[PDB]
Amino acid sequence: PVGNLLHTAPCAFVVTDAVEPDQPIIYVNTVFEMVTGYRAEEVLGRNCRFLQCRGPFAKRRHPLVDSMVVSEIRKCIDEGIEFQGELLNFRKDGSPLMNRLRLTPIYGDDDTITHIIGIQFFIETDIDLG
Amino acid sequence: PVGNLLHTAPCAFVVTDAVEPDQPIIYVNTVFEMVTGYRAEEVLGRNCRFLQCRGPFAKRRHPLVDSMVVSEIRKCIDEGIEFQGELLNFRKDGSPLMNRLRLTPIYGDDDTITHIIGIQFFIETDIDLG
Numbered sequence: 655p656v657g658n659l660l661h662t663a664p665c666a667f668v669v670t671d672a673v674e675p676d677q678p679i680i681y682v683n684t685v686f687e688m689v690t691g692y693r694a695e696e697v698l699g700r701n702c703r704f705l706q707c708r709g710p711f712a713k714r715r716h717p718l719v720d721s722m723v724v725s726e727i728r729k730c731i732d733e734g735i736e737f738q739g740e741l742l743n744f745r746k747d748g749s750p751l752m753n754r755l756r757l758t759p760i761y762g763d764d765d766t767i768t769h770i771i772g773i774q775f776f777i778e779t780d781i782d783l784g
Numbered sequence: 785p786v787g788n789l790l791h792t793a794p795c796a797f798v799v800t801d802a803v804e805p806d807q808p809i810i811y812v813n814t815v816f817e818m819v820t821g822y823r824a825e826e827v828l829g830r831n832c833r834f835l836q837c838r839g840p841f842a843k844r845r846h847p848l849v850d851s852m853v854v855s856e857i858r859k860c861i862d863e864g865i866e867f868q869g870e871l872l873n874f875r876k877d878g879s880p881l882m883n884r885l886r887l888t889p890i891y892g893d894d895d896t897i898t899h900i901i902g903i904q905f906f907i908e909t910d911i912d913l914g
């Protein structure tokens with residue numbers, strides 16, 4: 655028996671304020687809410703990096719997140735350009751997702767960057783975690 | 785013969801400036817480019833309703849697009865609120881697409897709508913046209 659289908663494309667995305675300190679989340683779409691397990695009120699105003707800790711309670715990023723990719727994200731955000739890579743993330747229930755992630759900055763009335771759009775493509779993964 | 789595959793999700797979206805008049809396009813991702821046929825230079829600065837017109841040389845929207853839904857969009861934008869609905873549009877090469885469109889607006893530093901994001905889901909249709 656088939657229902658409770660989704661009508662659109664399953665694309666997950668987030669928007670951040672590139673004006674306030676440290677890219678706070680101002681918008682998540684409900685595909686994000688439904689793949690990650692985090693509701694929008696849980697994540698508004700927070701930086702996206704909680705996805706790199708495994709669970710809602712863990713406060714340090716997981717060892718197997720590639721500290722080099724995360725470094726490159728930081729470069730791109732800072733140099734005002736597009737990031738594109740793949741990075742271990744974690745659902746609220748603990749499960750691992752390879753996040754095939756793309757960051758695109760948006761300019762306002764200026765030549766200043768006012769927002770960044772983030773497009774997650776979470777992929778299931780059988781990474782051994784201990 | 786298994787090549788030139790998309791690596792992420794076939795997700796299509798567009799961003800416009802809500803400050804300048806008539807919501808001009810400031811960004812389009814390459815899935816939009818690839819589906820609709822319109823290259824990003826062609827469309828930058830223009831308003832999106834050209835998708836309602838069949839081909840790049842048509843001057844008036846095609847009769848078959850529900851002007852009752854076009855009306856609903858204008859209302860939503862004007863009230864600074866989200867829009868959601870389905871709508872006939874056309875590739876550059878003329879073929880018809882049913883566009884399952886979602887419009888979600890974005891706030892800036894002055895709690896005021898600075899951009900709008902439109903996510904397009906372009907479905908093939910066998911509609912008869914003329």
Ligand SMILES: Cc1cc2nc3c(=O)[nH]c(=O)nc-3n(C[C@H](O)[C@H](O)[C@H](O)COP(=O)(O)O)c2cc1C
Pocket residue numbers: 668669670677701702703705706724725727728731741742743753755757770771772773774
């Ligand atoms: C708009 C946006 C979306 C992001 N989405 C994710 C994400 O889904 N998963 C993730 O691991 N990091 C994501 N990040 C990256 C972090 O927010 C952060 O910028 C990165 O972890 C580097 O900074 P840090 O080393 O100080 O943590 C996103 C960043 C931005 C700006």
Ligand SMILES: Cc1cc2nc3c(=O)[nH]c(=O)nc-3n(C[C@H](O)[C@H](O)[C@H](O)COP(=O)(O)O)c2cc1C
Pocket residue numbers: 798799800807831832833835836854855857858861871872873883885887900901902904
């Ligand atoms: C961000 C954004 C994306 C839009 N994308 C589309 C689209 O893909 N297809 C479409 O037919 N209309 C789209 N529209 C709507 C038209 O651009 C226009 O706003 C609408 O036709 C209502 O105005 P009008 O009756 O004055 O033409 C979009 C609008 C916005 C703000």
